Design the sequence.
């Protein structure tokens, strides 16, 4: 039913009543075979069908999902995201889902005004979770975060801090003794949710005077 | 709370009489 | 910003919510809801959702939805929906607890969409806990079945739908 999945996805987007339940049961069986490692080559085909449907009618499907079938859309997205999380092999489905999520986010930001983030909130949360990639700079990222702090962009600062936290969780480098001190007062002055983890990471593998920086900051 | 309150089917709830019956009938362990 | 101190706040607001629920006020609920939206951490969101689950089970939901702002405009509903459709299993379990409690408790005109959303996220929890097979998974499963019994007994309207969904899970 892999060929007819894309057509039922359009029926699932418009009106399904029980076809949505059947598709969700089929996807749970695929997740079952994926967890049991019993050759579950069904997630990518449904992902390909969903991506094709999005490329065909991005606005209509997003409007139908975020307007009427919010619950069914959220259930399908939750099934897809946990399935992608289980299937960590080669991240091909992860990249396809990231592209589909970016396109759906663009369509939702364009069209959904009254039904603001009924499921697009969970979509954006999954988007941030999947886009939490590992930074490779770890020295100019501090300057970028300092620039974002003067610019006062909350989402950009959160993304930069999340990147720097994985960057600190990666292999340690030689940190500057002035840039970190400047950045810590800025994230302290701003309400920073990840401030404690950032301070712990920057204080554990530190190539500088940690007590001096802490005393100066205090 | 448990899933179903009027549950006759639970181990530690059941009393001495058919505890003795349980001992005998688990020892038996078959029906024709 | 101390995570352990926030966990203290969790395990203390649980105690206050369990002891004296009627003293909980609308601004307190709204502030806790804003904190649960603005948190980044799944564990602390889980704790706050447990607190909201207990408060929803108690009477204070009527205080939060006592008029003299739409119920949909109330910040509780959005948090409950997004956390019921969140990825993590315990977060989803407490979200569907909040949804079941509010659906059985309050009866306003616009809550039918919440009823439908709650039941559909409910078989989402059924499929997840049915094919998870963990001790915590079975705990969240028993939580979902408590939600079933309470929802069906409080409202007989959704009974046939929930029974046929449970048969599909069978």
Sequence:
């Amino acid at each position: 039913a892999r060929v007819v999945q894309g057509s039922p996805e359009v029926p699932g987007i418009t009106v399904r009543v029980l076809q949505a339940l059947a598709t969700l049961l089929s996807s749970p069986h695929g997740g079952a075979l994926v967890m049991s490692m019993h050759r579950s080559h069904f997630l990518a085909c449904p992902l390909l069908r969903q991506l094709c449907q999005y490329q065909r009618c991005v606005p209509q499907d997003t409007g139908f999902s975020s307007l009427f079938l919010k619950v069914l859309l959220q259930m399908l997205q939750w099934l897809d995201s946990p399935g992608v999380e289980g299937g960590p092999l080669r991240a091909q489905l992860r990249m396809l889902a990231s592209q589909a999520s970016a396109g759906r986010r663009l369509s939702d930001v364009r069209g959904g005004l009254l039904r603001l983030a009924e499921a697009l909130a969970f979509r954006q949360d999954l988007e941030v979770v999947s886009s939490t990639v590992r930074a490779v700079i770890a020295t100019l990222r501090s300057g970028e975060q300092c620039s974002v702090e003067p610019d006062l962009i909350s989402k950009v600062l959160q993304g930069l801090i999340e990147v720097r936290s994985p960057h600190l969780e990666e292999l340690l480098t030689a940190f500057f003794s002035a840039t970190a001190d400047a950045a810590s007062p800025f994230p302290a002055c701003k309400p920073v949710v990840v401030v404690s983890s950032l301070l712990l990471q920057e204080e554990e593998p530190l190539a500088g005077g940690k007590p001096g920086a802490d005393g100066g900051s205090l | 709370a448990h899933v179903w309150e009027d549950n006759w089917d639970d181990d530690n709830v059941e009393d001495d009489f058919s505890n003795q019956l349980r001992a005998e009938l688990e020892k038996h362990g078959y029906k024709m | 910003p101390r995570k352990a101190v926030k966990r203290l706040a969790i395990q203390d607001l649980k105690l206050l919510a369990n002891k004296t629920p009627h003293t909980w006020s609308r601004e307190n609920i709204q502030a806790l809801c804003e904190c649960a939206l603005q948190t980044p951490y799944d564990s602390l969101k889980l704790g706050m959702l447990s607190v909201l689950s207990t408060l929803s089970g108690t009477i204070a939901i009527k205080h939060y939805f006592s008029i003299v702002s739409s119920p949909r405009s109330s910040d509780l509903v959005k948090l409950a929906q997004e956390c019921c459709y969140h990825n993590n299993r315990g977060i989803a379990a407490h979200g569907v607890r909040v949804l079941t409690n509010i659906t059985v408790s309050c009866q306003e005109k616009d809550l039918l969409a919440l009823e439908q959303d709650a039941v559909f996220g409910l078989e989402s929890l059924l499929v997840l806990c049915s094919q998870d097979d963990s001790p915590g998974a079975q705990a969240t499963l028993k939580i979902a079945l408590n939600c079933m019994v309470k929802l069906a007994k409080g409202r007989p309207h959704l009974s046939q739908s929930v029974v046929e969904t449970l048969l599909t899970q069978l």
